[PDB]
Amino acid sequence: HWGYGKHNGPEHWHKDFPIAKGERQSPVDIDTHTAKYDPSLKPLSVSYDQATSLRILNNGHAFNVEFDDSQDKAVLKGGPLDGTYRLIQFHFHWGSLDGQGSEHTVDKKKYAAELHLVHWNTKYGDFGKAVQQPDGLAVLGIFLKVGSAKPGLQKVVDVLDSIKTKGKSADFTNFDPRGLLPESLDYWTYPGSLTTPPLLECVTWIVLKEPISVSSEQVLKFRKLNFNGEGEPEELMVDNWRPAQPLKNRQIKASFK
Ligand SMILES: [Hg+2]
Ligand SMILES: [Hg+2]
Ligand SMILES: [Zn+2]
């Protein structure tokens, strides 16, 4: 069962998920001097005002904040995207130290964490169907640096106690993901994959240039979570990130000059 340790971590995934060595795997290093401004991108539309969060869940590898996605409540459109993509869940990847934790990197710089807001292409009807398509998914990726507290993140931080171990969930309604956005919507975009098994190559990545700042205390609370389920040897949930993968035959575009 895949994880992030020595015996079941990213170096092992290809054995059960051969696509791990595929042609459009994620994450990737974003070489800022190789990415090219793309004037054919429309502005990005992040419409999260009617968002309907339901629950937070520790899934053994991270925590998902889940959303009701049966209607166009929280949606991503515009930018490199055709049509409407519905928010289904968000989650983070983080490190054991501030010097690591992000999945994407910018000129090889690792941020302390990365937030992924996962959306699925509404013409495919549901999420399961979206993941059979090369344009099924769009992930908004937002870097986290240690700094000032992010007030919009505190609700999440405060619930972590109650979902310490694998399989625990807690009610998590009326959470507003807008509080997790940086001021600018400048981004890089490339065709990629999910960064966890089964590593399906269904993703349009939209990675914001501007990181959000979180507090040391905020990040510290992420690191108190558990990989293991209740009553098992304690393995702190830390360093749940896949390192950068071969760019291969791919182009990263900027939305900004
Ligand atoms: Hg897991
Ligand atoms: Hg796909
Ligand atoms: Zn992720």
Three-class SS string for the chain?
Answer: CCCCCCCCCCCCHHHCCHHHHCCCCCCCEECCCCCEECCCCCCEEEECCCCCEEEEEECCCCEEEEECCCCCCCEEEECCCCCCEEEEEEEEEECCCCCCCCCCEECCECCCEEEEEEEEEHHHCCHHHHCCCCCCEEEEEEEEEECCCCHHHHHHHHHHHHHCCECCEEECCCCCHHHHCCCCCCEEEEEECCCCCCCCCCEEEEEECCCEEECHHHHHHHCCCECCECCCCCCECCCCCCCCCCCCCCCCEECCC
Q: Binding site annotation covers 105?
A: no
Residue 52 annotated as part of some ligand binding site: no
Q: How far is the CA of 112 from the centre of ligand 3 (A)?
A: 14
The answer to whether 119 is a known ligand-binding residue is: no
- Separation of CA 144 and ligand 2 centre (Å): 27
Q: CA 86 to CA 105: how far, in whole Å?
A: 26
Ligand approaching nearest to the C-alpha of 228:
1
CA distances, 56 to each of 32, 78, 150, 157, 216 (Å): 35, 28, 19, 11, 22
Close Cβ partners of 202 (under 8 Å, ≥ 6 residues apart): 130, 131, 132, 133, 134, 135, 136, 137, 193, 194
251 φ, ψ (degrees, to nearest 5): -120, 135
Q: Whole-angstrom Cα distance, residue 47 to residue 227?
A: 33
**Could you say which of 12, 33, 61, 104 is catalytic?**
61
By the 8 A CB rule, do 240 and 4 touch?
yes
Q: Closest-lying ligand to the alpha carbon of 226?
A: 1
Give yes or no: 61 in active site.
Answer: yes
Is 195 annotated to bind a ligand? Reply is yes
Closest to 77 measured CA to CA, from 119, 45, 108:
45
Q: Which residues have beta carbons under 5 A from ligand 3 (an ion)?
A: 116
Q: Resolution in Å, one decimal, please.
A: 2.0
Distance (Å) of CA 189 to CA 138, 204, 251: 10, 7, 9
- In the structure encoding, which two tokens stand for residue 152, read together? 């919009």
The ligand placed nearest to the CA atom of residue 167 is 1
CATH number of 1-257: 3.10.200.10
Q: Give residues with Cβ within 8 angstroms of 76, minimum separation 6.
A: 44, 45, 46, 47, 84, 85, 87, 117, 119, 138, 140, 206
In this structure, are residues 112 and 80 in contact, taking their beta carbons and an 8 Å threshold? no
Task: Parse the chain into domains and list their residue ranges.
Answer: 1-257
Task: Sort residue 4 into left (φ over 0), alpha (ψ -120 to 50) or beta.
Answer: alpha
* Distance from C-alpha of 164 to C-alpha of 120, rounded to nearest angstrom: 28
116 is in an annotated binding site: yes
Expressed in angstroms and rounded, the spacing between residue 59 Cα and the centre of ligand 1 is 5
CB-count burial class (<10 Å; 0-12, 13-18, 19+) for 172: buried
Burial annotation 127-153 (CB, 10 A radius, 16+ → b, else e):
beebbeeebbbbbbbbbbebeeebeeb
State the Cα–Cα distance between residues 219 and 201, nearest whole angstrom. 30
> Which ligand is nearest to the Cα of residue 61, counting in written order?
1
Q: Which residues surround ligand 1, an ion (CB under 5 A)?
A: 59-61
| Ligand 1: centre distance to CA 198 (Å) | 11
CA of 70 to the centre of ligand 2 (A): 21
d(CA 28, CA 14): 17
Cα–Cα distance, 146 to 100 (Å, whole number): 11
**Dist. CA 128 → ligand 2 center (Å):** 10
Q: In which residue are the tokens 């990197």 written?
A: 105
Structure token pair of residue 105 = 């990197």
The rounded Å distance from CA 167 to ligand 2 centre is 27
Contact 218, 150 (CB under 8 A): yes
Strands 137-146 and 212-214: parallel
